[PDB]
Every structure is written in structure tokens, then in C-alpha cells.
Amino acid sequence: STGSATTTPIDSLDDAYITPVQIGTPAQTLNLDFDTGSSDLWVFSSETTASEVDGQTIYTPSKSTTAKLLSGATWSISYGDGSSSSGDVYTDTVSVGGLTVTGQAVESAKKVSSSFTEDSTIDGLLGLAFSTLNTVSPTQQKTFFDNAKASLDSPVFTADLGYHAPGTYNFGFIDTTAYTGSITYTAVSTKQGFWEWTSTGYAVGSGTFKSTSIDGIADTGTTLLYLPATVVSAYWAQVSGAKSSSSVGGYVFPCSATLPSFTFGVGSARIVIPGDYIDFGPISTGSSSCFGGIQSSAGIGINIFGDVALKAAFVVFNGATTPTLGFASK
Numbered sequence: 001s002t003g004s005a006t007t008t009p010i011d012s013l014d015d016a017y018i019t020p021v022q023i024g025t026p027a028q029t030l031n032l033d034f035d036t037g038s039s040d041l042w043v044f045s046s047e048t049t050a051s052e053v054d055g056q057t058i059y060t061p062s063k064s065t066t067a068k069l070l071s072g073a074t075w076s077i078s079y080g081d082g083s084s085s086s087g088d089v090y091t092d093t094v095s096v097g098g099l100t101v102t103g104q105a106v107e108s109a110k111k112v113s114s115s116f117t118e119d120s121t122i123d124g125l126l127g128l129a130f131s132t133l134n135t136v137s138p139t140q141q142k143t144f145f146d147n148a149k150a151s152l153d154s155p156v157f158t159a160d161l162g163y164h165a166p167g168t169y170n171f172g173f174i175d176t177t178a179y180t181g182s183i184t185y186t187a188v189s190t191k192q193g194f195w196e197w198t199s200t201g202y203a204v205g206s207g208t209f210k211s212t213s214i215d216g217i218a219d220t221g222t223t224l225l226y227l228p229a230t231v232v233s234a235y236w237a238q239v240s241g242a243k244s245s246s247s248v249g250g251y252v253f254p255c256s257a258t259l260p261s262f263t264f265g266v267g268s269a270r271i272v273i274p275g276d277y278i279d280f281g282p283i284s285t286g287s288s289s290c291f292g293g294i295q296s297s298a299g300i301g302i303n304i305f306g307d308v309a310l311k312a313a314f315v316v317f318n319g320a321t322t323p324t325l326g327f328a329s330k
């Protein structure tokens with residue numbers, strides 16, 4: 001079997017991507033944020049505290065004839081961005097672009113933090129990292145990908161995020177018309193439960209490529225590109241007037257600048273992120289200072305190849321016996 005769904009940026013800056021997901025019987029369609037950096041499928045629901053819901057579509061388990069309450073199971077998650085959510089668990093039929101999983105754990109939110117409430121376009125998350133990070137207690141649950149894997153024509157899912165435009169998440173197959181050249185596969189460590197790999201280096205604009213190992217995670221759930229302070233300082237030093245602002249919480253640059261591109265290595269191959277992809281608009285409405293798309297990971301503890309980097313490539317999340325990541329230009 002296979003699945004294919006369109007993913008769309010929630011706003012003019014590509015702050016996040018939403019993909020329609022069918023849950024329950026009859027189908028309840030919610031727009032979820034596909035997250036390769038987490039492993040919980042959670043939704044805003046009829047049980048979420050009323051004051052914590054503002055515009056989101058909710059899952060009502062009581063209206064689903066296939067929903068079964070998972071006895072005594074609870075979930076609670078805290079993300080790297082300080083956001084959190086928690087609640088109870090149901091098992092239900094979940095479909096992504098024609099691909100169906102029966103008995104998927106659907107984590108119904110009883111509580112969400114303000115960051116989730118203020119994002120009216122995001123009805124919940126769909127975790128695509130390894131099932132070892134799933135927060136369901138006392139019995140850990142599997143991801144949608146993990147549940148569908150055996151049935152898939154090939155044990156893979158692909159992320160093809162668009163820049164200011166719709167994209168695609170495919171399950172079970174590789175669309176050879178969706179990229180140029182070849183896909184370069186690279187080793188993955190699943191020890192931290194992430195699609196963790198090692199980039200072979202970088203280049204800023206037309207500059208000389210620096211061969212250096214950068215360990216990081218392929219994370220569709222993170223908007224920006226988080227890299228070591230040395231690399232990020234080398235990038236912003238090419239932008240006239242750019243500086244790291246402690247009040248804003250990162251590198252900012254004059255909105256009138258044309259940004260240089262950023263290249264990252266995947267083995268001997270290179271993925272070029274165009275400069276416009278690194279522009280995240282005014283720091284505040286009407287400001288002439290803009291927020292940078294490449295930020296230091298010094299406060300995080302891990303490098304994150306978020307949407308800024310992933311949207312420049314066709315990305316294969318290969319869930320074979322030994323998982324690997326594949327990258328191609330497009």
C-alpha cells in the first residue's frame with residue numbers, strides 16, 4: 001500500500017506545515033503538523049479545556065464508532081520550544097492520503113499550552129520520529145509510520161516541503177519525478193529516538209565549502225535551521241548589518257538585504273538553501289529588522305535541520321531494518 005497527501009504552509013513565512021488527516025468513523029478531518037522530531041499523534045479534541053481552544057478543529061471520540069478508549073493510558077509531552085500538551089488516549093482508524101492504519105493511538109488533548117492555542121491552523125501533531133520517544137504511559141504506543149510500515153510497498157516516507165507553496169508527504173514509495181539528480185543516502189543513529197545524521201560540511205553563498213562533521217536531526221517539526229555558533233556566525237558575517245540580538249533572541253538582519261544561500265553537505269552531495277528561504281520577515285509588525293532563518297543551536301544541545309533546510313531538498317526517511325536518510329536536490 002501507499003499514501004500521498006499535500007502539505008501546506010500555515011502562513012506567508014512557512015512557519016509550519018499542515019497536512020489533512022482523516023480520523024475515526026465517519027471521517028473527522030484535522031490538519032496536523034507532521035513532525036519527524038517527535039513520536040506522538042495528538043489532537044485538539046472535545047475534551048480540551050474550552051479556554052485553550054481558539055479556532056482549531058476538534059476530534060470528538062464519542063462521534064466515532066471505531067474509537068476505543070485505551071484504558072488507563074495518558075500522555076504528556078514538552079517540546080524543545082517550551083510548548084506542551086497532555087491528555088488521554090483512544091485507538092481509532094487514521095488515514096493519510098488514502099493510506100489507512102486501524103487501531104492507531106490517537107492522543108486526545110485535555111490540556112494544551114498557549115503556543116498551541118494561538119496557532120488556529122494547527123489541529124495537533126503527527127509524530128514521525130522513532131516510537132521509542134512516544135510518551136503514552138503506562139503502555140508506549142507506536143507512530144502512524146511504524147503501524148503502516150509492514151503494509152507499505154517500501155518501508156519509507158518522504159518529505160517534500162514547498163517554499164511559499166504546497167508540498168507532499170508520501171508513504172510507501174519514492175516519486176522519481178519529485179527531484180533532480182540522485183538521492184544520496186547517509187547513516188542514521190536512532191539512539192536519541194530521532195532521525196539523527198551527520199552533515200559533511202557547509203558553504204555560505206559562493207564561498208569555499210568547509211568540510212566539517214555536523215551531527216543533527218532531520219526535523220520537519222522545527223521551523224528554522226539550528227547549527228553550531230561558529231557556522232551561524234560565519235553565515236551572518238556575510239550579511240551587512242546583521243547581528244545577534246539578545247532582546248529578539250537570535251540573529252536579525254536589515255529587511256532590505258538580499259541573503260546569501262546556505263549549502264549543507266550530505267556525503268559528497270550538496271543541498272543549496274536559497275537566501276530567500278532564510279528570511280523570516282519583520283521581528284515585529286512594521287519593523288525594518290528581520291528575523292534570521294539560521295540560528296545558533298548553542299542553547300539547545302543538538303543541531304536541528306528544520307524546515308529551512310528540509311524544504312530545499314526531497315527527503316527520504318528510510319525506515320528499513322537499519323534506518324537511513326536520503327537527500328536529493330529538487
Ligand SMILES: NCCN1CCOCC1
Pocket residue numbers: 010015016114115116118119
Ligand atoms: N504559537 C507560536 C509558535 N508557532 C509555531 C508554529 O508556527 C506558528 C507559530
